[PDB]
Ligand binder design. Structure first.
Ligand code: F6C
Ligand code: CLA
Ligand code: CLA
Ligand code: CLA
Ligand code: CLA
Ligand code: CLA
Ligand code: CLA
Ligand code: CLA
Ligand SMILES: CC1=C(/C=C/C(C)=C/C=C/C(C)=C/C=C/C=C(C)/C=C/C=C(C)/C=C/C2=C(C)CCCC2(C)C)C(C)(C)CCC1
Ligand SMILES: CC1=C(C/C=C(\C)CCC[C@H](C)CCC[C@H](C)CCCC(C)C)C(=O)c2ccccc2C1=O
Ligand SMILES: CC1=C(C/C=C(\C)CCC[C@H](C)CCC[C@H](C)CCCC(C)C)C(=O)c2ccccc2C1=O
Ligand code: SF4
Ligand SMILES: [Ca+2]
Ligand SMILES: [Cl-]
Lengths: 749, 143, 80, 42, 222, 170
């Protein structure tokens, strides 16, 4: 006890494990049919339906968060253990340009050890593309014992995280007043989690990572390097590397900060040795954002008078206190939104999922162009995998944001609470929002894709002067070209005199090549880039249309005026009014999952082809860059046929010709993804009554053999058939692209 | 001709369109004991006045969704709502409650209007009513 | 308009009438079951065809059937 | 060689006028006639 | 005939049997089943019987011919793929390509679909056009129509009806837009969109394979 | 409580909160109304032929340009201007055939929708079929004339250029 906020019941009982459905009143009835089995896992985590008190739900959520953190620590422990026992980390530490990262060996079972490929140095394993080796090199790891220590620490943290979740629910659980302290939570997360976290990491970088990386770039062998604590212990060794450590922590308090300008650099480019960002520049970044986040954490009034109250700031943002052109939001403004966000967990989850997915996408777009780890940009499989993975995670998270914005509407939205505020006023003109989104999606679909169809027709006619090419009708992205020119002019010896190099070489500047291969070089933006960015705008907008339509019409529409009474996840409202199939908000999350797939797949395809034809390659002794596919994005990626021939047919040479090699698992998974995609269409195109009527004949054949079962076999429900089809489509269609990307990048480098 | 104050509402895009004035409009009237916020079936939140309220909607289903909200989401319940159909010439017709009770109760005097003394599995099978015009439930016998 | 037919297996539970979003159905005296009531569908020009009345019916097979017929502006549920 | 469309066949001026008539001159009159036929009132 | 023929004959047997299953099931359950005893009173084509009784999507007998058109198309795809690859390997002289390559599925994927596509998809490239340009264009056209089918096949009616309601709002409130629909815009019905998506799937499936079979054969053997 | 109790910039359309529109600055400000209500479609008092004539002149004029710059004939001046002229001609004749068949199909007895006698649409004021036929004739005349005026200015661009540079005063 220290804050007098716990005393939680729910005694740790064991008997409550042999009674599935104990959470739901109808789930603990007695199965009867098979739909109960699927209903068990359809709302197992939905703690909002189970009970009605916000405080009990908040306690459950807090302990579930702790258990999730435990799961993530188990995963981290496993990754560090794989890097410490089944890896060539030491070999890669010796030569990180000729050795392929590998952290997984296959047992010698049926045909199975062929997947163990030669990774350089006599190591027979699987080439990992997770970027773990490049991350551990940048953090400061040199030997595998340190990785083993980190694995043990993560396992201990996992055990500690599953004790904190049991102690904050079964022993001393917080009150609801503690969860509603958003001021204190924001202060602590902004200053103590982000601020102190990045400050501690800056301390690590300044005393462990910067030493080790400086010696590594100098040329020292990995086990000839001192361990990190000697860098911490004696200041003579550390002052050999940096001459600003001879004055200790004195120039900082006497505000002579340019003394420290040799390990807090502000270069802003790429290390020529490694290929990653300047490590001193990274440490300076973390110091600056620690000072920024800690200072940001003193903003909200907590127990001492000074600060803001978010409720006051929300309630004052309203007409006539707004900017005159922003005054259309009326005299209520954001008045009832502090009580929306402190009483609805779904509203918070919707905002946090949207921001988390957007930030994961930002992470994907900032780590190919500013490679932040040593020898990262030259391992093209890792760059591809990291960009692609974070784009998929971001897209899924963003779809879940709309999912929970719709769950908030059907369940947690109260019309009496929020009257004539921004939330009420959005629901009160949503036909305008949706119709204008329909028109912009149409405009973007004609002016991106139908231009590709124009190009196909003009190229098949034999009139390429009529095409939307760089040699036909040019469509230069002059605004992005101008931004690229401003970015390369800014960094001159201007508007950013402190930096030497450009923030990325993607904007302009020079060419960084490491080990012969290109780390980074300018990404020229022509007509093909205009066309593919408008493809991206179009697909993002139709995803927004599909998802926002379900959020805005989750309560009711002109068709079904009482859709909130039907639920958030219901199949339909019968074949009447023409047929109201897929009117729920859940069905809009269903249809937006497909559109997020179609949007993120084209983003990862644009990245793969453009980086493979206009950045990645092999620099010779002179300096001439021979790109991987040979600069064919500017003329083949402007037709659909060139996308099917010069990208899909041509670059799938390495995944279908992989049988009998060490990449044969990728060919197997390529075919497996095609199977699972096609198998999904059985659930997506067919309906429930066919399958229930065919199960009738199968039940008859079973009754005749007297093999009748008590649990009555029923077809999958309508929304469950939709969920199964969507999950299968996404799984197969993404496993296919994963196998295609990874087989391609593990064969041609 | 219809009595009641329009509920306090800022307007929406979900309201009446052309078909309201060229085909038909519906009106729902109800008495509330206090001025309080309800949910419009067209989207948004409106405030019913104390006393008599009158609201025009585009569909009968919207008027019945509002009425179901009145008699279930409010304590005390508002069960005295009346729904009228308004025609383009101005003609108003009291439709709900059709009798004057409430369809869910049983009134002496309503009369059968869909009853078929059968048992579903004994409609005349379609081979016999082919070129007749009748379809299998709009008939009179039982096979 | 749709055709809503009520059969003599009706038990007068009123659940079809309570589930109707458009007020097509009402209860009439019958003395053909022990509740003394049977459903009726006079305002079947209002029927949209949602079949909520059929979902609400407890008898096997249903004592109420909706047959989707000629579409009007009311049965298509059009506010435009 | 082939700078334009040709016909090495009899009455080769007939595609020259038949393709406009069948494909972009007579179709919108036919569409108008069919639209007036399906929208005429009793 | 050899070992690669036995497997594809068993695949053809599977295809004819499942297509017959769907069609026989929908014909014999046309008059009624346990889920809908009076199905003969509702006709041959009708959307469903609502979401009651667990849900009754695709319950009509017309929906069986709907669901078996996919299986007919798939079975005839297997049949014509077998015939075409068998004969391409015979006509090229390299019959061992089909012999020791049709017993596993990557051989079908790589030695038939990928391999005999190189001339078709190069019908027009950034360097010029040969006479296979229309077959490349129709190949892509069939892919487009087949993909458009999945819009009618996966997305269902209420989504589009609510979208069309917003469009009706937008049109009545825009200035200078003097047209007005004489007949009210509604989304395509349930059975209608099933038929439209099936027609699209069929047309794209026929166009893609017709363009591939004429160009993979007419290029190798002009 | 707050639902139309405070006075905001966004009002109900025509003071009726049960109408399916809002009074926003884009459909209800004095500048937006002064521009739109004085456009030929909405200018008070005009006969339908003069409305259509001015609409057509403005429309046939700009419809010449897209094919002059972007068309298949764009490599040569004379053919580009001719392709733009006949594109404007074809689009005009198609649009006016559509106007004529809209009037033919819509105005049959009492029309349905916004041209019914009971309709309250302020944004569609051509309530009679005679208005629509006069509009079709005017849009056709004005649009074909504006198209050939743009064509004649583009054909003589060498002369119009030497004029506007004072090269004709030698
Ligand atoms: C005439 C009548 C009319 C009018 C007037 O008058 C109109 C108008 C409008 C406006 C207001 C708007 C805007 C414009 C734009 O931008 O975009 C364009 C488009 C178009 C289409 C354009 C149109 C134009 C016109 C058509 C012209 C004519 C031409 C000629 C006449 C033809 C020829 C004839 C012969 C005989 C063939 C709109 C729109 C929309 N739509 Mg709408 N329309 C209509 C028709 C129709 C139909 C049939 C359909 C089916 C297909 C639809 C559909 C649609 C959709 C989806 C949408 C969208 O998205 C949009 C919106 O919402 O926003 C927001 N819609 N629209
Ligand atoms: C993939 C299967 C397939 C194949 C290889 C063919 C092949 C042929 N058909 Mg076809 N046809 C098919 C399926 C097929 N058909 C089906 C399922 C139908 C029923 C609708 C038809 C109905 C049909 C008609 C009415 C005609 C043919 C004709 C022909 C012959 C000339 C066209 C050509 O040279 O090659 C090209 C083959 C393609 C498939 C090119 C793709 C064009 C797409 C499919 C257009 C979409 C329309 C529709 C789906 C089917 C049209 C097929 C036909 C017009 C080509 C050719 C032998 C013509 C003939 O008999 O010659 C004297 C003819 O008049 N067929
Ligand atoms: C995300 C978590 C995760 C995943 C996907 C894996 C996956 C794997 N582990 Mg691992 N492991 C983990 C966490 C994980 N582990 C943790 C937290 C520890 C303790 C620190 C271990 C300790 C461990 C050992 C000792 C071994 C594996 C092995 C394996 C491989 C085969 C396991 C099996 O056949 O059964 C497999 C690829 C085996 C292996 O790699 O075979 C050579 C094996 O020997 N794991
Ligand atoms: C500076 C103090 C502090 C710190 C470091 C944290 C940290 C955390 N909080 Mg907490 N919180 C605080 C104060 C703090 N909180 C206060 C004062 C309140 C009351 C208003 C809350 C109310 C609160 C709630 C309701 C929740 C959190 C949650 C979390 C976790 C977020 C998971 C994550 O994003 O990345 C994870 C990063 C991890 C780095 C490593 C684990 C670090 C351990 C737990 C502590 C580190 C000790 C460090 C030396 C000090 C995270 C570990 C969420 C959670 O996940 O529950 C468990 C959540 O549900 N916090
Ligand atoms: C927040 C995390 C953190 C932690 C735990 C440490 C810890 C330490 N630092 Mg320090 N350092 C940090 C951040 C951190 N630093 C930042 C953000 C800067 C940039 C201004 C520095 C700049 C710095 C200098 C110049 C020196 C230290 C030194 C030291 C060591 C003792 C000297 C001293 O405390 O005074 C000590 C182990 C001294 C040292 O080198 O000891 C080994 C030393 O002189 N640090
Ligand atoms: C912080 C992340 C987060 C959290 C806490 C939740 C939490 C919740 N979600 Mg949710 N969601 C998220 C992200 C999240 N979601 C994302 C990223 C998506 C997009 C796919 C969704 C889309 C979504 C929908 C459509 C629904 C929910 C629902 C729910 C609720 C019940 C979940 C359940 O039934 O048990 C757990 C369910 C499973 C474990 C199913 C797993 C099977 C998957 C599909 C296979 C995975 C394949 C594998 C990775 C390979 C619960 C409160 C349901 C609800 O009713 O809310 C009230 C609901 O209908 N979510
Ligand atoms: C290739 C297949 C394909 C195509 C062409 C489309 C097209 C479309 N989808 Mg769709 N969709 C698809 C697959 C496809 N989808 C699949 C597989 C799913 C499964 C989940 C969906 C699910 C889906 C949803 C949920 C939504 C859409 C929407 C849309 C519309 C977007 C607006 C737009 O782009 O305007 C432009 C039109 C096109 C790009 C169509 C092709 C036009 C060609 C290139 C030009 C034709 C020239 C000329 C007119 C031809 C005239 C010839 C004459 C003889 C007729 C659009 C018509 C959204 C919408 O309604 O937006 C408003 C909507 O919300 N789709
Ligand atoms: C319009 C966008 C823009 C952006 C994003 C920046 C951004 C930046 N400027 Mg800058 N600057 C700008 C316009 C901009 N500038 C203009 C129009 C001028 C006048 C010509 C300047 C003149 C200027 C000077 C003199 C300096 C910066 C500096 C900086 C950097 C330090 C961050 C900070 O100031 O706090 C930062 C990256 C500082 C820097 O270069 O970092 C050392 C600094 O010395 N700027
Ligand atoms: C909205 C707005 C705007 C726009 C505008 C526009 C859009 C424009 C335009 C324009 C145009 C578009 C114009 C036009 C025109 C025209 C004209 C000027 C015409 C003409 C003509 C003529 C003169 C003809 C003649 C003839 C005839 C009729 C007969 C015979 C032949 C001839 C040729 C003689 C802005 C933003 C700017 C601002 C303001 C407002
Ligand atoms: C195939 C299909 C079915 C049938 C699918 C079913 C019934 C689920 C199949 C899962 C099987 C039945 C697994 C269950 C078997 C037992 C769990 C035993 C498994 C043995 C292990 C214990 C070893 C639907 O119900 C359906 C509904 C709506 C749209 C499309 C479809 C659809 O496509
Ligand atoms: C896209 C889509 C729509 C919207 C599509 C509409 C409204 C079609 C209208 C597009 C234009 C107006 C017609 C296109 C014309 C065709 C190219 C040719 C048709 C001409 C013949 C009929 C003669 C639905 O209404 C729908 C309903 C149920 C399930 C799936 C869907 C669905 O996927
Ligand atoms: S087809 Fe299925 S989802 Fe559509 S209305 Fe009928 S039962 Fe509902
Ligand atoms: Ca030309
Ligand atoms: Cl091409």
């Amino acid at each position: 006890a220290s804050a007098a906020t716990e005393q939680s019941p729910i005694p740790t009982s064991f008997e409550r494990w042999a009674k599935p459905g104990h959470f739901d009143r109808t789930l603990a009835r007695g199965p009867k049919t098979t739909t109960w089995i699927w209903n068990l896992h359809a709302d197992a985590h939905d703690f909002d339906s189970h009970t009605n008190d916000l405080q009990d739900i908040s306690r459950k959520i807090f302990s579930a968060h702790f258990g999730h953190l435990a799961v993530v620590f188990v995963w981290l422990s496993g990754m560090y253990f794989h890097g410490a026992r089944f890896s060539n980390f030491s070999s890669w530490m010796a030569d990180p340009t000729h050795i392929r990262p590998s952290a997984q060996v296959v047992w010698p079972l049926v045909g199975q050890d062929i997947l163990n490929g030669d990774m350089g140095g006599g190591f027979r394993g699987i080439q990992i593309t997770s970027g773990l080796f490049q991350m551990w090199r940048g953090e400061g790891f040199t030997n595998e014992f340190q990785l083993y220590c980190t694995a043990i620490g993560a396992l201990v943290m996992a055990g500690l995280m599953i004790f904190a979740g049991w102690f904050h629910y079964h022993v001393r659980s917080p009150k609801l007043e503690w969860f509603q302290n958003v001021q204190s939570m924001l202060n602590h997360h902004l200053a103590g989690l982000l601020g102190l976290g990045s400050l501690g990491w800056a301390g690590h970088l300044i005393h462990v990572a910067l030493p080790t990386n400086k010696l590594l770039d100098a040329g020292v062998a990995p086990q000839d390097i001192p361990l990190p604590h000697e860098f911490v212990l004696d200041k003579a060794l550390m002052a050999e590397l940096y001459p600003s450590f001879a004055q200790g922590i004195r120039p900082f308090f006497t505000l002579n900060w340019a003394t420290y300008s040799d390990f807090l650099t502000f270069n802003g480019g790429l290390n020529p040795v490694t290929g990653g960002l300047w490590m001193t520049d990274i440490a300076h970044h973390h110091v600056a954002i620690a000072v920024l986040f800690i200072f940001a954490g003193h903003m909200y009034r907590t127990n001492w008078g000074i600060g803001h109250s978010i409720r006051t700031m929300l309630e004052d943002a309203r007409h006539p206190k707004m900017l005159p052109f922003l005054s259309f939001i009326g005299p209520v403004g954001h008045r009832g939104l502090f009580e929306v966000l402190t009483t609805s967990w779904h509203a918070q989850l919707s905002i946090n999922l949207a921001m988390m997915g957007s930030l994961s996408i930002i992470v994907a777009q900032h780590m190919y162009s500013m490679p932040p780890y040593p020898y990262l940009a030259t391992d093209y499989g890792t760059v591809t995998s990291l960009f692609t993975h974070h784009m998929w995670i971001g897209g899924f998270l963003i779809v879940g944001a709309a999912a929970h914005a719709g769950i908030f509407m059907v369940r947690d939205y109260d019309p009496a609470e929020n009257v004539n505020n921004v939330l009420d006023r959005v629901l009160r003109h949503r036909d305008a929002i949706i119709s204008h989104l329909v028109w912009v999606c149409q405009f973007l679909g004609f002016h991106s894709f139908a231009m590709y169809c124009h190009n196909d027709t003009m190229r098949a006619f034999g009139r390429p002067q009529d095409m939307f090419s760089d040699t036909g009708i040019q469509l230069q992205p002059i605004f992005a070209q101008w931004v690229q020119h401003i970015q390369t002019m800014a960094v001159g010896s201007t508007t950013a005199p402190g930096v030497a190099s450009p923030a990325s070489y993607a904007f302009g500047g020079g060419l960084v090549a490491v080990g012969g291969k290109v780390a980074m070089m300018p990404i020229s933006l022509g007509t093909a880039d205009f066309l593919i960015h408008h493809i991206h705008a179009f697909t993002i907008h139709v995803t927004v249309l599909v998802l926002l339509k379900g959020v805005l019409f989750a309560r009711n529409s002109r068709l079904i005026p009482d859709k909130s009474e039907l639920g958030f996840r219901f199949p339909c409202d019968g074949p009447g009014r023409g047929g109201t199939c897929q009117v729920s908000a859940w069905d809009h999350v269903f249809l937006g999952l497909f559109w997020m797939y179609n949007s993120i797949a084209m983003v990862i395809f644009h990245f793969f082809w453009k980086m493979q034809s206009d950045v990645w390659g092999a620099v010779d002794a002179n300096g001439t860059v021979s790109h991987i596919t040979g600069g064919n994005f500017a003329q083949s990626s402007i037709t659909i046929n060139g996308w099917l021939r010069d990208f899909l047919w041509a670059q799938a040479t390495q995944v279908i010709s992989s049988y009998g090699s060490a990449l044969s698992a990728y060919g197997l998974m390529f075919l497996a993804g095609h199977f699972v995609f096609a198998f999904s269409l059985m659930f997506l195109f067919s309906g429930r009554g066919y399958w229930q009527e065919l199960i009738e004949s199968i039940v008859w054949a079973h009754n005749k053999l007297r093999i009748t079962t008590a649990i009555q076999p029923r077809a999958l429900s309508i929304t469950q058939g939709r969920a199964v089809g969507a999950a299968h489509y996404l799984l197969g269609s993404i496993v296919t692209t994963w196998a295609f990307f990874l087989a391609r990048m593990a064969a041609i480098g | 001709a219809l009595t009641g104050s329009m509920p306090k509402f800022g307007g929406s895009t979900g309201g009446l369109l052309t078909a309201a004035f060229v085909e038909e409009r519906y009106a729902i009237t109800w008495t509330s004991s206090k001025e309080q916020v309800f949910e419009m079936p067209t989207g948004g939140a409106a405030t019913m006045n104390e006393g008599e309220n009158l609201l025009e909607l585009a569909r009968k289903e919207q008027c019945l969704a509002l009425g179901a909200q009145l008699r279930t989401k409010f304590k005390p319940k508002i069960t005295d709502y009346k729904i009228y159909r308004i025609f383009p010439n101005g003609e108003t017709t009291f439709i709900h409650p059709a009798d004057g009770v409430f369809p869910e109760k049983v009134n002496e005097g309503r009369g059968y209007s869909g009853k078929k003394d059968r048992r579903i599995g004994e409609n005349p099978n379609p081979a016999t009513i082919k070129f007749s015009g009748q379809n299998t439930f709009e008939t009179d016998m039982k096979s | 308009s749709h055709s809503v037919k009520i059969y003599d297996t009706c038990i007068g539970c009123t659940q079809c009438v309570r589930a109707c979003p458009t007020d097509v159905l009402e209860m009439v005296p019958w003395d053909g079951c022990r509740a003394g009531q049977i459903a009726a569908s006079p305002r079947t020009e209002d029927c949209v065809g949602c079949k909520r009345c059929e979902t609400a019916c407890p008898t096997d097979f249903l004592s109420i059937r909706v047959y989707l017929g000629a579409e009007t502006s009311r049965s298509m549920g059009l506010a435009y | 060689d082939a700078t334009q469309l040709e016909g090495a066949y009899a009455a080769a001026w007939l595609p020259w006028i038949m393709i406009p008539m069948i494909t972009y001159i007579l179709p919108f009159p036919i569409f108008a006639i069919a639209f007036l036929w399906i929208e005429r009132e009793g | 005939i050899g070992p690669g023929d036995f497997l594809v004959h068993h695949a053809i047997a599977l295809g004819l049997h499942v297509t017959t299953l769907i069609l026989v099931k929908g014909a014999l359950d046309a008059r009624g089943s346990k889920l809908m005893p009076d199905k003969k009173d509702f006709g041959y084509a009708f959307p469903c019987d609502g979401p009651g009784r667990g849900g009754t999507c695709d319950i009509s007998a017309w929906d069986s011919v709907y669901l078996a058109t996919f299986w007919m198309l798939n079975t005839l795809g297997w049949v014509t793929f077998y015939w075409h690859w068998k004969h391409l390997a015979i006509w090229s002289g390299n019959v061992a390509q089909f012999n020791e390559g049709s017993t596993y599925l990557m051989g079908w994927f790589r030695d038939y679909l990928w391999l005999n596509s190189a001339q078709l998809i190069n019908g027009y490239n950034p360097y010029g056009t040969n006479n296979l340009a229309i077959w490349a264009w129709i190949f892509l056209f069939g892919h487009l129509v087949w993909a458009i089918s999945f819009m009618f096949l996966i997305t269902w009616r209420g989504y589009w009806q609510e979208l069309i309601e917003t469009l009706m709002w937008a049109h009545e409130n825009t200035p200078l837009s003097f047209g007005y629909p004489k007949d009210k815009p509604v989304a395509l019905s349930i059975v209608q969109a099933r038929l439209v998506g099936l027609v699209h799937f069929t047309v794209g499936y026929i166009a893609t394979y017709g363009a591939f079979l004429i160009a993979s054969t007419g290029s190798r053997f002009p | 409580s707050d639902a139309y109790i405070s006075d905001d910039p966004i009002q109900p359309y025509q003071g009726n909160p049960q109408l399916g529109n809002l009074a926003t600055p884009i459909n209800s400000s004095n500048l937006a109304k002064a521009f739109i209500n004085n456009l030929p479609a909405y200018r008070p008092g005009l006969t339908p032929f003069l409305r259509g004539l001015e609409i057509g002149m403005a429309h046939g004029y700009f419809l010449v340009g897209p094919e002059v710059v972007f068309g298949p004939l764009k490599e040569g001046s004379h053919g580009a201007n001719l392709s733009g002229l006949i594109t404007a001609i074809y689009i005009t004749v198609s649009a006016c055939l559509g106007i004529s068949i809209f009037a033919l199909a819509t105005f049959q007895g009492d029309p349905r929708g916004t041209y019914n006698s009971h309709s309250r649409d302020r944004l569609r004021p051509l309530r009679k079929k005679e208005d629509w036929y006069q509009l079709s004739g005017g849009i056709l005349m004005g649009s074909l004339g504006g198209a050939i005026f743009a064509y004649a200015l583009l054909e003589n661009f060498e002369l119009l250029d030497s004029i506007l540079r004072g090269a004709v005063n030698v």
